[PDB]
Amino acid sequence: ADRVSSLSNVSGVLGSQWGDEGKGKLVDVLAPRFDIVARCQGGANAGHTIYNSEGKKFALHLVPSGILHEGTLCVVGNGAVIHVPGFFGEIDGLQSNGVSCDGRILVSDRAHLLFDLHQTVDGLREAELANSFIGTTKRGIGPCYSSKVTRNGLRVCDLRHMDTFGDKLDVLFEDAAARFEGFKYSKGMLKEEVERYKKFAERLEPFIADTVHVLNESIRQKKKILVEGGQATMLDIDFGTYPFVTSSSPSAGGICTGLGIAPRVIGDLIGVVKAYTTRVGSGPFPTELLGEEGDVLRKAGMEFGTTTGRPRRCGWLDIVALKYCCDINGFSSLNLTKLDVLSGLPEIKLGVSYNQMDGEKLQSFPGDLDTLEQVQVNYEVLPGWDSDISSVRSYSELPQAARRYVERIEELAGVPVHYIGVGPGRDALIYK
Amino acid sequence: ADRVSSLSNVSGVLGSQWGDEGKGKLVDVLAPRFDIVARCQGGANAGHTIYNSEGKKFALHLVPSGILHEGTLCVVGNGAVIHVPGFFGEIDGLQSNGVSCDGRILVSDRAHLLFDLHQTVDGLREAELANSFIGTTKRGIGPCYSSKVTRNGLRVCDLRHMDTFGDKLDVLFEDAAARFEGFKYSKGMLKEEVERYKKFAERLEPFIADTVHVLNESIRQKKKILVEGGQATMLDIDFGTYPFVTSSSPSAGGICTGLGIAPRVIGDLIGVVKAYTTRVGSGPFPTELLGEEGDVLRKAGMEFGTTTGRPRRCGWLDIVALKYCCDINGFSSLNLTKLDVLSGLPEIKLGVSYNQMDGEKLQSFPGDLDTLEQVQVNYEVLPGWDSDISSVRSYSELPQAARRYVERIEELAGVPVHYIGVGPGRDALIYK
Ligand SMILES: Nc1nc2c(ncn2[C@@H]2O[C@H](COP(=O)(O)OP(=O)(O)O)[C@@H](O)[C@H]2O)c(=O)[nH]1
Ligand SMILES: Nc1nc2c(ncn2[C@@H]2O[C@H](COP(=O)(O)OP(=O)(O)O)[C@@H](O)[C@H]2O)c(=O)[nH]1
């Protein structure tokens, strides 16, 4: 079961559901076998939680999970968005925990910039909207990618030319003001922003590097590279549950557009499938458990915001969406995480079919929410088990009902399971 | 030289420079060998020009170039943006020219909608800006992709639920008004838009289909599919000459995010490289020829807007950019087009190296325009020729100086040339 040494020159870990499946943990385990670990999409809005040898907790945002290994180079691709202030704060927090970052992190010169501006703008949007509620989710991710699409946003390369940075930054400052009256843009406030990032440019300079060239050059030199997926594909701007999705492309296609590598060079793709689904926030949720069964999962899995402490909605594993997701990415294998959370459940259901409001079986996963929010899920109950498995390291040591579980999944999904998570620890992973 | 039968289950044609390289022509020639031809990115803003057997001129916008073959199904992927009014106008124009479209064109339900709104908004932007000039380029492409990223835009699936379409459309109508004072949004004007697209929904209905499912299902059934690239990768939102680029991703990664297919399933990728570069509009142009040499190319190649008649800037083939582009996409081969345009030139230069403002050779293509607009190109003059080759069908029949040309290119680029265009006609293509 040498799964660690079976991976190709260029491999990648992708989330196959919604929210946090625990990709980081896997990336941390597989990282020492790779020369480079790169984040291709998203911003610091995410948050991978990993633990070292001593059991020390680490919560990453932008930095790839491979940062805990000396011989590994972390890279933030061009597909990403960087909130420079928060970035350095993240760096400082790692440097104080004995983890050096100097010369071990590359920042794509082609990656766009997320200013505090986008953050306040993001907030202004909801303030007037139907009123999305309670949560300091001032993640200016949406607006930043918009500036990018609009082509009026700034990129990392701009910090090398502070001369023009001024008249390049005021342009989107002026824009935002024209839109919201809750923004005045003082000419004095602009002066600061320039002098602020002028200082930031000094510190960030050694990190900047031609991400596209470096990566491609690396491949020519046979350097192994593991791509860390930002979020899940069900959250994808195109394939996810629109409009309830992210403005980024968490799918496999995104690793090409976010890193600048050829689709032909991408080898194995491990899809992280949590034993049960968890959707954070409003949106369609077929397998959603509003009853005690959901409460049991939530507490056991600790499905609560790392900052907000808000409970993530839970439910049974959705195979319909998973199968659909498998096709889109073309996963070589899968990492079935948080299996230890299902312990204690007498019955564990699986969403297999999708019926219409009347009773017609759908051949594929619904695009529009109109049809999706009105579906009749067809479950498949399986024998559960009452046994703490957070200690099982070998596959054969698992309960018969638990083994039957992964097997039924890999059967319906079509893709085999090579990793089974039974604990948050770096050590808590079973190889199949 | 059975290049037509060498292509994989899923192949694709991509532009490797800027502007129009003549991808459509190739797609039209290769189309009859494929079961499906699909457009993965962009909107009607493009415009592929192809000719049938009788020599009839056809100018496509959204519809893939494979539309001229009966046993071929054209597909407009989820990555695209559809301006429904213009679409039907394009359909009507094809139906009158004896080309039926009923049941031969699929429209992705997940593809976003480009309303006249985005068109007027796009215009409002430039009106107040530094003043981009003269040109009815009211292509609301930029703003539409923005609505998408913002997640407040509408998609094709919404037309199936006109009930909510109303309150879903007014949302971005209200938005635009808040931004520009040159927009008032009459409640009466909204009423129309709803009743307009309510009628459009009736006509478009038979075209709509789950693009993602269909395509993937097709692959499972071994149906060949050829992807038609929208524009070129040097125009890519991430990899192109930002900010002078399009809001879409014309690169290979884009065919994944635009169609919903696995990166592992994409086979051959033919990169269309015109014999000389042509950049339409302002932006960095290293190999730009402002002298007579440029005028000769422009007239011979007919480098003028199909609608605006404006002359496209011209120059020598840029190998630096090409090589850089080759890596990003991973082209299996290349299609060297418009070779017949180089006839008459005593000398033909090739951009090989890139020197700094002082004299330092760059290892890679520049990201920021600051450095790019200030480079010293290092050419490589080759023997030209004075011979009308618009009649040469075999490779050996070409002039020695012309053959030496393609060979030096495929040598420096690393990827072989399999197609050489010597005329706009369907028949005017040489196989190497
Ligand atoms: N109990 C348990 N927790 C796990 C397991 N795998 C991962 N986790 C935890 O689940 C959370 C996963 O979300 P997070 O890592 O923030 O998101 P990611 O970006 O998808 O990695 C982390 O806090 C992990 O330490 C597992 O097998 N069992
Ligand atoms: N002279 C000449 N014209 C060509 C050749 N191949 C294509 N063209 C024409 O060049 C133009 C290329 O732009 P177009 O095809 O609209 O753009 P595309 O979107 O890249 O296909 C078209 O009008 C073609 O008919 C060639 O080998 N020689």
From Swiss-Prot, chains A, B:
Q: GO molecular function, one example?
A: adenylosuccinate synthase activity
Q: Which GO annotations describe the biological process of this protein? A: 'de novo' AMP biosynthetic process; IMP metabolic process
Q: What is its EC number?
A: 6.3.4.4
Q: Where in the cell is it found?
A: Plastid, Chloroplast
Q: Which of this chain's residues are annotated to bind GTP?
A: 19-25, 47-49, 312, 338-340, 421-423
Checking Gene3D superfamilies in the record gives:
Adenylosuccinate Synthetase, subunit A, domain 1 (3.40.440.10), Adenylosuccinate Synthetase, subunit A, domain 2 (1.10.300.10), Adenylosuccinate Synthetase, subunit A, domain 3 (3.90.170.10)
Q: By its UniProt entry, which Pfam families does this protein fall under?
A: Adenylsucc_synt
Give me the Gene Ontology terms describing cellular component: chloroplast; cytoplasm
CDD domains annotated for this entry?
Answer: AdSS (cd03108)
User: Per its Swiss-Prot or TrEMBL entry, what cofactor is needed?
Assistant: Mg(2+)
UniProt catalytic activity: IMP + L-aspartate + GTP = N(6)-(1,2-dicarboxyethyl)-AMP + GDP + phosphate + 2 H(+)
Q: Which residues bind IMP?
A: 20-23, 45-48, 137, 151, 231, 246, 310
Major location (coarse):
plastid
Binding of Mg(2+), residues:
20, 47
The reply to whether Cell cycle figures as a keyword in the UniProt entry is: no
Highest rank taxon of the organism: Eukaryota
Q: How is the cofactor bound?
A: Binds 1 Mg(2+) ion per subunit.
Which residues are listed for substrate binding in this entry? 306-312
Q: What is annotated as the active site? A: 20 (proton acceptor), 48 (proton donor)
Residues annotated as coiled-coil are none
What family does this chain come from, according to its entry? Belongs to the adenylosuccinate synthetase family.
Q: Additional info?
A: This protein may be expected to contain an N-terminal transit peptide but none has been predicted.
Q: What does this protein do?
A: Plays an important role in the de novo pathway and in the salvage pathway of purine nucleotide biosynthesis. Catalyzes the first committed step in the biosynthesis of AMP from IMP.
Q: Subunit composition?
A: Homodimer.
Q: What is this protein called?
A: Adenylosuccinate synthetase, chloroplastic
- Organism of origin is Triticum aestivum
